Each structure stands twice: as structure tokens, then as C-alpha cells.
Design an enzyme around this catalytic site. Structure first.
Site, PDB file in Angstrom:
ATOM      1  N   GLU A 162      67.984 -64.818   3.235  1.00  0.00           N
ATOM      2  CA  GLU A 162      68.184 -64.755   1.796  1.00  0.00           C
ATOM      3  C   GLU A 162      68.481 -66.147   1.247  1.00  0.00           C
ATOM      4  O   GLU A 162      69.091 -66.986   1.914  1.00  0.00           O
ATOM      5  CB  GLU A 162      69.329 -63.794   1.459  1.00  0.00           C
ATOM      6  CG  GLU A 162      69.608 -63.617  -0.029  1.00  0.00           C
ATOM      7  CD  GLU A 162      68.390 -63.138  -0.790  1.00  0.00           C
ATOM      8  OE1 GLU A 162      67.766 -62.160  -0.332  1.00  0.00           O
ATOM      9  OE2 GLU A 162      68.062 -63.728  -1.841  1.00  0.00           O
ATOM     10  N   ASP A 214      67.966 -60.059   5.073  1.00  0.00           N
ATOM     11  CA  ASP A 214      68.886 -61.077   4.579  1.00  0.00           C
ATOM     12  C   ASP A 214      69.317 -62.069   5.651  1.00  0.00           C
ATOM     13  O   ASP A 214      69.370 -63.273   5.382  1.00  0.00           O
ATOM     14  CB  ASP A 214      70.122 -60.413   3.965  1.00  0.00           C
ATOM     15  CG  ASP A 214      69.798 -59.648   2.698  1.00  0.00           C
ATOM     16  OD1 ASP A 214      69.040 -60.183   1.860  1.00  0.00           O
ATOM     17  OD2 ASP A 214      70.288 -58.508   2.542  1.00  0.00           O
ATOM     18  N   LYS A 274      68.490 -47.419   0.968  1.00  0.00           N
ATOM     19  CA  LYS A 274      67.876 -48.500   1.731  1.00  0.00           C
ATOM     20  C   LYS A 274      67.411 -48.044   3.107  1.00  0.00           C
ATOM     21  O   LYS A 274      66.356 -48.484   3.583  1.00  0.00           O
ATOM     22  CB  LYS A 274      68.839 -49.677   1.854  1.00  0.00           C
ATOM     23  CG  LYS A 274      68.114 -51.006   1.804  1.00  0.00           C
ATOM     24  CD  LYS A 274      68.914 -52.118   1.180  1.00  0.00           C
ATOM     25  CE  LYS A 274      69.237 -51.849  -0.279  1.00  0.00           C
ATOM     26  NZ  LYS A 274      69.807 -53.077  -0.891  1.00  0.00           N
TER      27      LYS A 274
END
Ligand SMILES: C[C@H](C[C@@H](C[C@H](C[C@@H](C[C@@H](CCN1CCCC1=O)N1CCCC1=O)N1CCCC1=O)N1CCCC1=O)N1CCCC1=O)N1CCCC1=O
Ligand SMILES: COc1cc(CCNC(=O)c2[nH]c(-c3ccccc3F)nc(=O)c2O)ccc1O
Ligand SMILES: [Mn+2]
Ligand SMILES: [Mn+2]
Length: 179
Positions: free
Chosen positions: A64, A92, A118
Site C-alpha cells: 500500500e 496491503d 472482504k
């Protein structure tokens, strides 16, 4: 010129603000209109950065906060090196200690609702999921919260400080009823 925008610039670190601005613009979005999402992108960025700051020095690879192409490029190099499967969606972090990718989430709902969201999107039972909420709750895959309790507590504290600061400026209500 919204209150939320000036608060984001005062609450968050300048590099984190600049990184959230790039990330939104790369996806056709303006930090000046979609300011609730401006604040959220900064929050998710900081949490990711504190998370990698937890643990050891060479432990995490930060995915990320890069641009799409370079981020993916590093995801490859990790896969074509560790043999881990290529995730369908950009994660991430990557854990060199646990040999798995991490999807960090920061929610204004129940950690229950949002991990379910998710976990169904990624479907792959390889990518580790870790959730934080602005109320102090957290939920990770297999109850494997990866980091020390102290490192996760610091994140939780920071998330609640952001909430109070937003609330004292009356921006919290709009921020919660926006996710
Ligand atoms: C690598 C570099 C930037 C890093 C961003 C990230 C920020 C890190 C800095 C630490 C030190 N602390 C702590 C005290 C204040 C501070 O500053 N933290 C974590 C907490 C908040 C913060 O700021 N880290 C981690 C490695 C060193 C560094 O700076 N990023 C950006 C995305 C990918 C990445 O690794 N890069 C790479 C190229 C562009 C760029 O800028
Ligand atoms: C949703 O549109 C965007 C999508 C992207 C592509 C990559 N996306 C992330 O990496 C990401 N984004 C968020 C998030 C986004 C908007 C508001 C709140 C959020 F928490 N959470 C995460 O956990 C996370 O992992 C880049 C900027 C965006 O604006
Ligand atoms: Mn991400
Ligand atoms: Mn995430």
C-alpha cells in the site's frame, strides 16, 4: 473548501496526505469533493504504516502507498520468489515471517460485517485479513493477529483519537454514515 479537508491536512502527516491524494486521483477521484473518503484513505494509509512498523525491521514488504504498476511489480517478485500464489486483488503488506500477504481493513461498521465483505471478495484462503475499527475492535484470520498486542493497541488508540477529533468538529456523524 470543506472542514473535513482542512482537518485531514492538520490531523494526518504530510506524506500520508500526499499519498492519499495520488491514490484517489489515480482512480479518478478528488480529495476536495469526496472528503469523507479522503479521510478514510489517509486513515487506512497510516494504519498500514504503523502495522509494518510493528514487528521486526525486515519483516514486512509495504504494498500500500505505491502506484498500481510498481505495487503489482513487487507482488510478482514476492510470488515468483516465495512460490505464494498471485492474489487477485492488490494486498496491503507481505509478511516475510509468516510467508503470506495481508489485507488491512479499517471500518466504521462491525468488524464482523466488514471482514465478511472482504473475505468474500478475496475468496482465496491464502491472503491474511486483519481488521481494525474506530471503536477499538479487531478481527484477523484464524484469530492470528500477527503482531504484538502492544503494536495493535497503539493502532486502536490512534483510530479512537481520530474519531474524537472528528467528533469535536462535528464531522464524525457524516464520516460514519458514509461508508
Ligand atoms: C520508503 C519510502 C516511504 C515509505 C513510507 C513509510 C513511512 C514510515 C516512516 C517512519 C520512519 N516514520 C515513523 C516516525 C515518522 C516517520 O516518518 N512511517 C510509519 C509511521 C508513519 C510513517 O511515516 N516508510 C517505511 C520505510 C521507511 C519509510 O519512510 N513507503 C511509501 C509506500 C511504500 C513505502 O515503503 N518511499 C518509497 C518510495 C516512495 C517513498 O516515499
Ligand atoms: C475504493 O476506491 C479506491 C480504490 C483504490 C485501489 C486499492 N484500494 C486499497 O488498497 C484499499 N482502499 C480502502 C478504502 C478506500 C476508500 C475508502 C475507505 C477505505 F478504507 N481500504 C482498504 O483496506 C484497501 O486495501 C485506491 C483508491 C480508492 O479511492
Ligand atoms: Mn490496499
Ligand atoms: Mn486494505
Amino acid at each position: 473548501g470543506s472542514h473535513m479537508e482542512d482537518f485531514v491536512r492538520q490531523c494526518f502527516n504530510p506524506m500520508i496526505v500526499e499519498l492519499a491524494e495520488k491514490a484517489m486521483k489515480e482512480y479518478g477521484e478528488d480529495p476536495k469533493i469526496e472528503t469523507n473518503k479522503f479521510a478514510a484513505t489517509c486513515t487506512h494509509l497510516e494504519v498500514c504504516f504503523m502495522y509494518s512498523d510493528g514487528g521486526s525491521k525486515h519483516r514486512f514488504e509495504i504494498i500500500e502507498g505505491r502506484d498500481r504498476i510498481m505495487a503489482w511489480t513487487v507482488v510478482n517478485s514476492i510470488c515468483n520468489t516465495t512460490g505464494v500464489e498471485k492474489p487477485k486483488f492488490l494486498p496491503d503488506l507481505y509478511d516475510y515471517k509468516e510467508n503470506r500477504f495481508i489485507e488491512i481493513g479499517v471500518t466504521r461498521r462491525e468488524v464482523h460485517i466488514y471482514y465478511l465483505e472482504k473475505a468474500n471478495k478475496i475468496k482465496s484462503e491464502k491472503t491474511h485479513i486483519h481488521i481494525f475499527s474506530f471503536t477499538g475492535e479487531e478481527m484477523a484470520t484464524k484469530a492470528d493477529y500477527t503482531l504484538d498486542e502492544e503494536s495493535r493497541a497503539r493502532i486502536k488508540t490512534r483510530l479512537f483519537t481520530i474519531r474524537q477529533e472528528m467528533a469535536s468538529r462535528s464531522l464524525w456523524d457524516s464520516f460514519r454514515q458514509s461508508e
